[PDB]
């Protein structure tokens, strides 16, 4: 329940930054495999689950087409429907 | 008659060289600028020689060796380099002071480059054009952490704080678990209720993200403890003036793991919607970002439940739709906001009264209205 609530809160802080004009929504769609590696290994994912979490991230960034401030919600829901937090502590 | 006094070297000046010296008569010997009388290995303040009966002077001619300003003074939190011949402290030698950047910064006067240039003057002391014998002063930088937190936030959020993200965060264990921030190299900013709870061994730790390591990094004893007079320990409902300062017995040596935090300057840091980090412990240091909320939407939420003391010297941050807890920050810790223009970190708030440690808004102590009090206790 920690992972789920934390990701909800991060996505909703991103939506607030979007509403204030501090973050561009299209920019969130850009992340490298190196950056995914870093974020997944720092928070503590299984090195075997790295590529699976990356698949989830790419599929959820692709599934959303709404480039408004609500995308951060939708992507989050996708992350929860793909069960990303089962890969995280 | 006695021989004409001839100098041993060249830097010696025979004051009034008389064509010949008879008995009873004398002469004196002085040097040029940046030179001193020696005679062997001693240092003479003056030399005189009398024509002692026969053709002899009662004491031989001295030599004017070069003055040595000695080893330059150690610059606290700084150092120096020789611009002339290295290791030479003699006359007409120059040095360049510099502070341990990016941690400390030499004070300016408006004036640079030539600021830390000291030379070995004729009096045997290290002086300068502007300012005489006094050495420069390395001043600490407030914000500017070596390893600032990443600004590109992701949904895949890592709530674990790394080394250097919060170099000002400190750890206190007075009546319970607490914390605060660093001001300069000697002062600690925290909340007053961590000192005088509403219901003392102090114990201040700092310099790492692991709780086990903070305690391994040694204690930091305290001298004076200045609690703001508006705080009432007995009133277990009003945290007005919930702010205090702590002066360390000894100053700390700043580094990438330990840097101060800036004080607010203008009220634009409190505009609605500004994002601010609060860091706290449980066994390790975690951080969460919270938006500053409407000061009116928090009062309606407050009075709507059960009466508290939301004043103008306070402000609220957070949002109900967030799934975090209202007690997510750490007691006495500062509400850290970064200025996106100057990229410095200011402590706009202090974790004060968090009603309902479960879910909802969070209240803090507005530091801006208390800055003048903080600068008063520190400068003393």
Coordinates of C-alpha atoms in Angstrom, one line a residue:
Chain A
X1 CA 0.0 0.0 0.0
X2 CA 3.0 2.3 0.5
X3 CA 4.1 2.0 -3.2
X4 CA 0.6 2.7 -4.5
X5 CA 0.0 5.7 -2.4
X6 CA 3.4 7.1 -3.0
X7 CA 3.0 6.8 -6.8
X8 CA -0.4 8.4 -6.6
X9 CA 1.0 11.3 -4.6
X10 CA 3.9 11.8 -7.1
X11 CA 1.6 11.8 -10.1
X12 CA -0.8 14.2 -8.4
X13 CA 2.1 16.6 -7.4
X14 CA 3.1 16.4 -11.1
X15 CA -0.5 17.3 -12.0
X16 CA -0.3 20.3 -9.7
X17 CA 3.0 21.4 -11.3
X18 CA 1.2 21.0 -14.7
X19 CA -1.7 23.2 -13.5
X20 CA 0.7 25.9 -12.4
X21 CA 2.7 25.8 -15.6
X22 CA 5.9 24.5 -14.0
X23 CA 6.1 21.2 -15.9
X24 CA 5.3 20.5 -19.5
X25 CA 3.2 17.3 -20.0
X26 CA 4.9 16.2 -23.1
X27 CA 8.3 16.2 -21.3
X28 CA 7.1 13.4 -18.9
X29 CA 6.9 11.1 -21.9
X30 CA 10.7 11.2 -22.3
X31 CA 12.8 8.9 -20.1
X32 CA 15.8 6.8 -21.1
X33 CA 16.5 3.2 -20.3
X34 CA 19.5 4.5 -18.3
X35 CA 17.2 6.7 -16.2
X36 CA 14.7 3.9 -15.7
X37 CA 17.6 1.7 -14.5
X38 CA 18.6 4.4 -12.1
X39 CA 15.2 5.1 -10.7
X40 CA 14.4 1.4 -10.4
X41 CA 17.7 0.4 -8.7
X42 CA 17.7 3.4 -6.3
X43 CA 14.2 2.6 -4.9
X44 CA 15.1 -1.1 -4.8
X45 CA 13.6 -3.3 -7.5
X46 CA 14.9 -6.7 -8.4
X47 CA 17.5 -6.5 -11.1
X48 CA 15.5 -9.2 -12.9
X49 CA 12.3 -7.1 -12.6
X50 CA 14.0 -4.1 -14.1
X51 CA 13.1 -4.8 -17.7
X52 CA 9.6 -5.8 -16.7
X53 CA 9.1 -2.5 -14.9
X54 CA 10.6 -0.8 -18.0
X55 CA 8.1 -2.6 -20.2
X56 CA 5.3 -1.4 -17.9
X57 CA 6.6 2.2 -18.0
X58 CA 6.8 2.3 -21.8
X59 CA 3.4 0.6 -22.3
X60 CA 1.7 3.1 -19.9
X61 CA 3.4 6.1 -21.5
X62 CA 2.2 4.9 -24.8
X63 CA -1.3 3.9 -23.8
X64 CA -2.1 7.5 -22.7
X65 CA -2.8 9.9 -25.6
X66 CA -4.2 12.8 -23.6
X67 CA -1.3 15.3 -23.3
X68 CA -3.2 17.4 -20.7
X69 CA -2.5 17.7 -16.9
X70 CA -4.7 14.6 -16.3
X71 CA -2.3 12.2 -18.0
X72 CA -0.3 11.8 -14.7
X73 CA -3.4 10.3 -13.2
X74 CA -4.1 8.0 -16.2
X75 CA -0.5 6.7 -16.4
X76 CA -0.6 6.1 -12.7
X77 CA -3.8 4.0 -13.1
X78 CA -2.0 2.1 -15.8
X79 CA 1.0 1.5 -13.5
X80 CA -1.5 0.1 -11.0
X81 CA -3.3 -2.0 -13.5
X82 CA -0.1 -3.5 -14.8
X83 CA 0.8 -4.2 -11.1
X84 CA 4.1 -2.3 -11.0
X85 CA 4.1 -2.1 -7.1
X86 CA 4.3 -5.9 -6.9
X87 CA 7.8 -5.3 -8.3
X88 CA 8.6 -2.7 -5.7
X89 CA 9.0 -3.1 -1.9
Chain B
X1 CA 92.8 57.2 14.0
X2 CA 90.9 54.0 13.1
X3 CA 90.0 52.6 9.6
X4 CA 87.1 53.9 7.4
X5 CA 84.1 51.7 8.2
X6 CA 83.3 49.6 5.2
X7 CA 80.0 47.6 4.9
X8 CA 80.2 43.8 4.6
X9 CA 77.3 43.6 2.2
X10 CA 75.5 46.3 0.1
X11 CA 72.2 46.8 2.0
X12 CA 74.0 48.6 4.9
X13 CA 73.8 52.4 5.2
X14 CA 76.5 54.2 7.1
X15 CA 74.7 57.3 8.4
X16 CA 76.9 60.4 7.7
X17 CA 80.2 58.8 6.4
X18 CA 82.8 61.0 8.0
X19 CA 86.1 61.2 6.1
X20 CA 88.1 59.9 9.1
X21 CA 87.2 58.8 12.6
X22 CA 89.4 59.8 15.6
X23 CA 89.2 58.6 19.2
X24 CA 85.9 59.2 21.1
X25 CA 84.3 59.4 17.7
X26 CA 81.7 56.9 16.4
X27 CA 79.3 55.9 13.6
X28 CA 76.0 54.1 13.3
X29 CA 74.7 51.6 10.8
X30 CA 71.2 51.3 9.4
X31 CA 69.6 49.2 6.6
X32 CA 67.4 49.9 3.6
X33 CA 63.7 49.2 3.3
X34 CA 62.8 45.6 4.1
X35 CA 66.2 44.8 5.8
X36 CA 67.3 44.5 9.3
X37 CA 70.6 44.4 11.3
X38 CA 71.8 40.9 12.2
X39 CA 75.4 40.4 13.5
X40 CA 75.7 36.7 13.3
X41 CA 72.3 35.1 13.9
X42 CA 70.7 37.7 16.3
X43 CA 68.5 40.6 15.3
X44 CA 69.7 44.1 16.2
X45 CA 67.4 47.2 16.5
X46 CA 70.4 49.5 16.1
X47 CA 74.2 49.4 15.6
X48 CA 76.8 51.8 16.9
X49 CA 80.6 51.4 16.9
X50 CA 83.1 53.7 18.7
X51 CA 86.7 54.3 17.8
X52 CA 88.3 52.6 20.7
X53 CA 91.7 54.1 21.3
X54 CA 93.7 52.1 18.7
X55 CA 92.6 51.6 15.2
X56 CA 89.7 49.3 16.2
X57 CA 86.0 49.5 16.5
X58 CA 84.6 48.0 19.7
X59 CA 82.2 45.8 17.6
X60 CA 82.5 44.5 14.1
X61 CA 80.4 45.7 11.2
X62 CA 77.0 43.9 11.0
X63 CA 75.2 42.8 7.9
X64 CA 71.7 43.8 6.6
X65 CA 70.0 40.6 5.8
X66 CA 66.4 40.4 4.4
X67 CA 63.4 40.6 6.6
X68 CA 61.2 37.5 6.9
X69 CA 57.5 38.0 7.5
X70 CA 57.3 34.4 8.7
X71 CA 54.7 31.8 7.9
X72 CA 51.5 33.6 6.9
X73 CA 48.5 33.3 9.2
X74 CA 46.2 30.3 8.6
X75 CA 43.0 31.4 7.1
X76 CA 40.1 29.7 8.9
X77 CA 38.1 27.5 6.6
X78 CA 40.5 28.6 3.8
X79 CA 44.1 28.4 2.7
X80 CA 46.6 30.3 0.6
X81 CA 49.1 29.8 -2.3
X82 CA 52.4 31.6 -3.0
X83 CA 52.3 33.8 -6.1
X84 CA 56.0 34.6 -5.8
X85 CA 58.7 31.9 -5.2
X86 CA 57.1 29.1 -3.2
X87 CA 58.1 28.8 0.4
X88 CA 59.8 32.2 0.4
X89 CA 58.4 34.5 3.1
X90 CA 61.0 37.3 2.7
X91 CA 60.4 40.9 1.6
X92 CA 58.4 41.5 -1.6
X93 CA 56.7 38.1 -1.4
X94 CA 53.0 37.8 -2.2
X95 CA 50.3 35.2 -1.4
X96 CA 46.8 34.5 -2.6
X97 CA 44.2 33.5 -0.1
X98 CA 41.2 31.5 -1.1
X99 CA 38.3 29.8 0.7
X100 CA 37.2 26.2 0.4
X101 CA 34.7 26.6 -2.4
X102 CA 31.9 25.8 -2.9
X103 CA 31.4 25.5 0.9
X104 CA 32.9 28.8 2.2
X105 CA 33.1 32.1 0.3
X106 CA 35.5 35.0 1.0
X107 CA 33.7 38.2 1.9
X108 CA 33.9 41.0 -0.6
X109 CA 33.7 44.8 -0.2
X110 CA 33.1 46.3 -3.7
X111 CA 36.7 44.5 -4.8
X112 CA 37.8 41.0 -6.0
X113 CA 40.8 39.2 -7.4
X114 CA 43.1 41.6 -5.5
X115 CA 41.0 40.8 -2.4
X116 CA 43.1 37.9 -1.1
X117 CA 46.5 39.3 -2.2
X118 CA 48.7 39.9 0.8
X119 CA 52.4 40.9 0.4
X120 CA 55.4 40.9 2.8
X121 CA 55.8 44.6 3.5
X122 CA 58.9 46.4 4.9
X123 CA 57.7 46.2 8.5
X124 CA 57.9 42.4 8.4
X125 CA 54.2 41.8 8.3
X126 CA 51.7 40.6 5.6
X127 CA 49.6 43.5 4.5
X128 CA 47.5 44.6 1.6
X129 CA 46.4 47.6 -0.4
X130 CA 42.8 47.6 0.8
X131 CA 42.8 46.5 4.5
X132 CA 46.1 46.3 6.3
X133 CA 47.3 43.3 8.4
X134 CA 43.9 41.8 9.0
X135 CA 43.3 38.5 7.2
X136 CA 40.2 37.9 5.0
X137 CA 37.1 36.1 6.3
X138 CA 35.7 32.9 4.7
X139 CA 31.9 33.0 5.0
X140 CA 29.6 30.0 4.5
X141 CA 27.1 29.9 1.7
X142 CA 23.6 29.3 2.8
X143 CA 21.8 27.2 0.2
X144 CA 23.5 25.5 -2.8
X145 CA 23.8 21.8 -1.9
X146 CA 26.4 19.7 -3.7
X147 CA 23.8 17.0 -4.6
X148 CA 20.5 18.8 -5.0
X149 CA 17.4 16.7 -5.5
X150 CA 16.3 16.0 -9.1
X151 CA 13.7 18.5 -10.4
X152 CA 12.3 16.1 -13.1
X153 CA 9.8 14.3 -10.9
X154 CA 8.5 10.9 -12.0
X155 CA 5.4 8.9 -11.1
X156 CA 7.8 6.1 -10.2
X157 CA 8.8 8.1 -7.2
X158 CA 11.7 7.3 -4.8
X159 CA 10.9 8.7 -1.4
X160 CA 14.4 7.8 -0.1
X161 CA 16.8 10.7 0.4
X162 CA 20.4 10.4 -0.8
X163 CA 23.6 11.9 0.6
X164 CA 23.7 15.7 0.0
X165 CA 20.1 16.3 -0.9
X166 CA 19.5 17.9 2.6
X167 CA 22.9 18.9 4.0
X168 CA 21.1 21.2 6.5
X169 CA 18.9 18.5 8.1
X170 CA 19.9 17.8 11.7
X171 CA 18.7 15.3 14.2
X172 CA 17.7 16.1 17.8
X173 CA 16.6 13.7 20.6
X174 CA 15.7 16.0 23.5
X175 CA 12.4 14.8 24.9
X176 CA 11.9 12.7 21.8
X177 CA 12.7 12.3 18.1
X178 CA 13.1 15.6 16.4
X179 CA 15.1 17.6 13.9
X180 CA 15.8 21.0 12.3
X181 CA 18.2 22.8 9.9
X182 CA 21.6 24.4 9.9
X183 CA 22.2 28.1 9.8
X184 CA 25.8 29.0 9.1
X185 CA 28.4 26.8 10.8
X186 CA 27.2 27.3 14.4
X187 CA 23.4 27.9 14.6
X188 CA 20.5 25.4 14.5
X189 CA 16.9 26.4 13.6
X190 CA 14.2 24.2 15.1
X191 CA 10.7 24.4 16.7
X192 CA 10.1 25.5 20.2
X193 CA 7.9 22.6 21.2
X194 CA 10.8 20.1 20.6
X195 CA 12.5 22.0 23.5
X196 CA 9.5 22.8 25.7
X197 CA 6.8 20.2 25.0
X198 CA 3.1 20.9 25.8
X199 CA 2.8 17.8 27.9
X200 CA 16.0 17.9 28.7
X201 CA 19.3 16.5 27.4
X202 CA 19.3 18.3 24.0
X203 CA 21.5 16.0 22.0
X204 CA 22.0 17.3 18.4
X205 CA 23.2 15.2 15.5
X206 CA 23.9 16.1 11.9
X207 CA 25.9 15.2 8.8
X208 CA 24.5 12.0 7.4
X209 CA 21.3 10.3 6.2
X210 CA 21.5 7.2 8.3
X211 CA 20.3 7.5 11.9
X212 CA 23.0 5.0 13.1
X213 CA 25.6 7.1 11.4
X214 CA 24.4 10.5 12.7
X215 CA 25.0 9.2 16.2
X216 CA 28.4 7.8 15.1
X217 CA 29.3 11.2 13.7
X218 CA 29.5 12.5 17.3
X219 CA 27.3 14.7 19.4
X220 CA 27.1 18.5 19.1
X221 CA 26.8 20.3 22.4
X222 CA 24.9 23.5 22.8
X223 CA 25.6 26.8 24.5
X224 CA 22.7 29.2 24.5
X225 CA 19.1 28.3 23.6
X226 CA 17.0 31.2 22.5
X227 CA 13.3 30.4 22.5
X228 CA 11.0 33.0 21.0
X229 CA 9.1 34.7 23.9
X230 CA 5.7 34.3 22.1
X231 CA 5.9 30.5 22.8
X232 CA 3.9 29.3 25.8
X233 CA 4.9 25.8 27.0
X234 CA 1.8 25.5 29.3
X235 CA -0.7 26.4 26.6
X236 CA -1.2 23.0 25.1
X237 CA -3.2 24.3 22.1
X238 CA -1.4 27.4 20.8
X239 CA 2.0 27.1 19.1
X240 CA 2.4 30.8 18.5
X241 CA 6.0 31.6 18.0
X242 CA 7.0 28.0 17.7
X243 CA 10.6 28.7 16.7
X244 CA 13.9 28.6 18.5
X245 CA 17.7 28.8 17.8
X246 CA 20.5 26.6 19.1
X247 CA 24.1 27.7 19.2
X248 CA 26.7 25.0 19.1
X249 CA 29.7 25.0 21.5
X250 CA 32.0 24.7 18.5
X251 CA 31.5 25.6 14.8
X252 CA 31.2 22.7 12.3
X253 CA 33.5 22.2 9.3
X254 CA 31.2 22.4 6.3
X255 CA 31.3 19.9 3.5
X256 CA 29.2 18.1 0.8
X257 CA 27.4 16.2 3.6
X258 CA 26.8 19.4 5.8
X259 CA 25.7 22.8 4.4
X260 CA 23.5 25.5 5.8
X261 CA 20.1 26.7 4.5
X262 CA 19.0 30.2 3.4
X263 CA 16.5 32.4 5.1
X264 CA 13.5 33.8 3.2
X265 CA 13.9 37.3 1.9
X266 CA 10.7 38.2 0.0
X267 CA 7.1 37.0 0.4
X268 CA 6.9 35.5 -3.1
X269 CA 8.2 32.3 -1.6
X270 CA 4.8 31.9 0.1
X271 CA 2.6 32.3 -3.0
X272 CA -0.1 29.7 -3.2
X273 CA 1.0 26.6 -5.2
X274 CA 4.7 26.8 -4.4
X275 CA 6.2 23.3 -3.9
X276 CA 8.3 22.6 -0.8
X277 CA 10.2 19.6 0.5
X278 CA 10.2 18.4 4.1
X279 CA 12.7 15.8 5.2
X280 CA 12.4 13.5 8.2
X281 CA 13.4 10.2 9.8
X282 CA 11.3 7.1 10.8
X283 CA 15.7 4.7 10.5
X284 CA 16.8 6.7 7.4
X285 CA 16.1 10.2 6.0
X286 CA 13.0 10.4 3.8
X287 CA 11.6 13.4 1.9
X288 CA 8.2 14.4 0.5
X289 CA 7.1 17.4 -1.5
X290 CA 4.0 19.3 -0.4
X291 CA 2.3 22.3 -2.0
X292 CA 1.5 25.3 0.1
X293 CA -2.2 25.5 0.6
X294 CA -4.8 28.2 0.7
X295 CA -4.6 29.8 4.2
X296 CA -8.4 30.1 4.1
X297 CA -9.2 26.6 2.9
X298 CA -7.2 25.3 5.8
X299 CA -9.2 27.3 8.4
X300 CA -12.5 26.0 7.1
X301 CA -11.1 22.5 7.2
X302 CA -9.8 23.2 10.7
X303 CA -12.9 24.8 12.4
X304 CA -15.1 22.3 10.4
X305 CA -13.7 19.4 12.4
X306 CA -13.4 20.5 16.0
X307 CA -10.6 25.4 17.7
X308 CA -6.9 25.9 16.9
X309 CA -4.5 28.9 16.4
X310 CA -3.9 29.4 12.6
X311 CA -2.4 32.9 12.6
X312 CA -0.6 35.1 10.0
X313 CA 2.8 34.0 11.4
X314 CA 1.7 30.4 10.3
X315 CA 0.9 28.8 7.0
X316 CA -0.5 25.5 5.9
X317 CA 0.8 23.0 3.2
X318 CA -0.5 19.8 1.8
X319 CA -3.7 18.5 0.2
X320 CA -6.5 16.1 1.3
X321 CA -6.5 14.1 -2.0
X322 CA -2.9 13.2 -1.2
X323 CA -2.6 9.7 0.3
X324 CA 0.3 10.6 2.6
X325 CA -0.1 11.2 6.3
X326 CA -0.4 14.6 7.9
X327 CA 2.6 13.7 10.1
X328 CA 4.8 13.0 7.1
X329 CA 7.3 15.7 8.0
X330 CA 9.6 15.6 11.0
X331 CA 9.2 17.8 14.1
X332 CA 11.2 20.9 14.1
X333 CA 12.3 20.3 10.5
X334 CA 12.2 23.1 8.1
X335 CA 9.8 23.5 5.1
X336 CA 12.5 23.6 2.3
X337 CA 11.6 25.5 -0.8
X338 CA 14.1 26.2 -3.6
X339 CA 14.1 29.5 -5.6
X340 CA 13.9 28.5 -9.3
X341 CA 15.6 31.8 -10.2
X342 CA 18.8 31.7 -8.0
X343 CA 18.6 27.9 -7.5
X344 CA 19.1 28.3 -3.7
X345 CA 17.2 26.5 -0.9
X346 CA 15.4 28.7 1.6
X347 CA 13.6 27.5 4.8
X348 CA 10.2 29.1 4.5
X349 CA 8.6 27.1 7.3
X350 CA 9.2 25.0 10.3
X351 CA 7.2 21.8 11.2
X352 CA 5.1 23.1 14.1
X353 CA 1.5 21.9 14.9
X354 CA 0.2 19.0 12.8
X355 CA -3.3 18.3 13.9
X356 CA -4.7 14.8 13.1
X357 CA -1.5 12.9 12.4
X358 CA -3.4 10.7 9.9
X359 CA -4.5 12.5 6.7
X360 CA -5.2 16.2 5.8
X361 CA -3.4 19.5 5.6
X362 CA -0.2 20.3 7.6
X363 CA 0.6 23.5 9.4
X364 CA 4.0 25.2 9.8
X365 CA 5.7 28.3 11.3
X366 CA 6.2 31.1 8.8
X367 CA 9.9 31.9 9.1
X368 CA 9.8 35.1 7.1
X369 CA 8.1 37.1 9.9
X370 CA 10.7 35.8 12.3
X371 CA 13.8 36.4 10.2
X372 CA 14.6 39.7 12.1
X373 CA 14.5 37.8 15.4
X374 CA 16.8 35.1 14.0
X375 CA 19.3 37.6 12.7
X376 CA 19.3 39.2 16.2
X377 CA 20.1 36.1 18.2
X378 CA 22.8 35.0 15.7
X379 CA 24.8 38.2 15.4
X380 CA 25.2 38.5 19.2

